[PDB]
Scaffold this active site. Sequence first.
Site, short mmCIF file in Angstrom:
data_model
loop_
_atom_site.label_atom_id
_atom_site.label_comp_id
_atom_site.label_asym_id
_atom_site.label_seq_id
_atom_site.Cartn_x
_atom_site.Cartn_y
_atom_site.Cartn_z
N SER A 1 -22.52 -8.69 -72.83
CA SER A 1 -21.89 -8.74 -71.52
C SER A 1 -20.83 -9.80 -71.39
O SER A 1 -20.14 -9.81 -70.37
CB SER A 1 -22.93 -8.99 -70.44
OG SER A 1 -23.75 -7.86 -70.29
N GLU B 1 -23.66 1.29 -74.64
CA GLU B 1 -23.56 1.49 -76.08
C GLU B 1 -23.01 0.27 -76.81
O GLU B 1 -23.34 0.05 -77.98
CB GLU B 1 -22.69 2.71 -76.36
CG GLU B 1 -23.29 4.05 -75.98
CD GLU B 1 -24.41 4.46 -76.90
OE1 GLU B 1 -25.47 4.90 -76.39
OE2 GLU B 1 -24.25 4.33 -78.13
B1 LIG Z 1 -25.43 -8.03 -70.73
O1 LIG Z 1 -25.09 -8.41 -71.99
O2 LIG Z 1 -25.65 -9.19 -69.95
C1 LIG Z 1 -26.82 -9.04 -69.14
C2 LIG Z 1 -27.74 -10.16 -69.47
C3 LIG Z 1 -29.02 -10.01 -69.74
C4 LIG Z 1 -27.13 -11.56 -69.47
O3 LIG Z 1 -26.31 -11.87 -68.57
O4 LIG Z 1 -27.43 -12.40 -70.35
C5 LIG Z 1 -27.27 -7.59 -69.36
C6 LIG Z 1 -28.30 -6.81 -68.80
C7 LIG Z 1 -28.46 -5.49 -69.17
C8 LIG Z 1 -27.63 -4.89 -70.06
C9 LIG Z 1 -26.62 -5.63 -70.59
C10 LIG Z 1 -26.45 -6.98 -70.22
#
Ligand SMILES: *[B@@]1([O])O[C](C(=[C])C([O])=O)C2=[C][C]=[C][C]=C21
Length: 264
Positions: free
Chosen positions: A45, A143
């Site tokens: 993310s 994905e």
């Molecule tokens: B993504 O990478 O970021 C969040 C997350 C857990 C974070 O902010 O560290 C997340 C939740 C669900 C899917 C993808 C992501």
Amino acid sequence: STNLVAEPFAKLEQDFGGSIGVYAMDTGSGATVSYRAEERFPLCSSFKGFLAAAVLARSQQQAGLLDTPIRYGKNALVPWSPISEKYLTTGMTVAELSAAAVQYSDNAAANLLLKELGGPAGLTAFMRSIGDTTFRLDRWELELNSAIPGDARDTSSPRAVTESLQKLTLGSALAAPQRQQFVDWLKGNTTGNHRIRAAVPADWAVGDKTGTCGVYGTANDYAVVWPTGRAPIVLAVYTRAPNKDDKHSEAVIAAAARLALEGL
Ligand SMILES: *[B@@]1([O])O[C](C(=[C])C([O])=O)C2=[C][C]=[C][C]=C21
């Protein structure tokens, strides 16, 4: 990027079990800390921070972009879309979607904003346009989180992340108002209290963006930090590990950030 006192990072990495990547720069002195700073890591993310910057940069050429409402559908709501879900009935403006993507890691927001930019390829071209030759986004949510070892899709390096974050928050990539907005969203992030923020003295201002792929011990955080009285520090901390079921560690990210800050 080299480092003649890397043994502390090497020991933390061995204790972790995976790979750690760190780059930090004191924009006041020019000093830096690096450890696998040139190596590729899954963005997860953390790309959402750069996505919001790309939106702000487009708003500099399209008036009213940020205030444009988007009345999106229920089937925009991919897992972990907490703001998008809450506001499904009303829609959200582009600025709200950017805010949500940065500060809650809202996935639906992220894909909706990518679509307005031309998809992963459009974000990547934005990053090329500011001088990042490392960043690549290839896939949509969810994905892009596959984090397969040696797969270069949807990766960057800690140095390129840091250098791009610096250009957008502290350099001239973005106009002054757009820039303050980007710093403000990062300062309001809610997802990073156990990562870089956990290594930063409570009296230092911080903005950050986290990432967690959910597989292969892969998670990250990058941040701008303002030490008291000083020009800011920018840093990026990324992890990965060789087995699908290896757990990521927030404590490892915080520790690695602390080593960088102590080295600076
Ligand atoms: B993504 O990478 O970021 C969040 C997350 C857990 C974070 O902010 O560290 C997340 C939740 C669900 C899917 C993808 C992501």
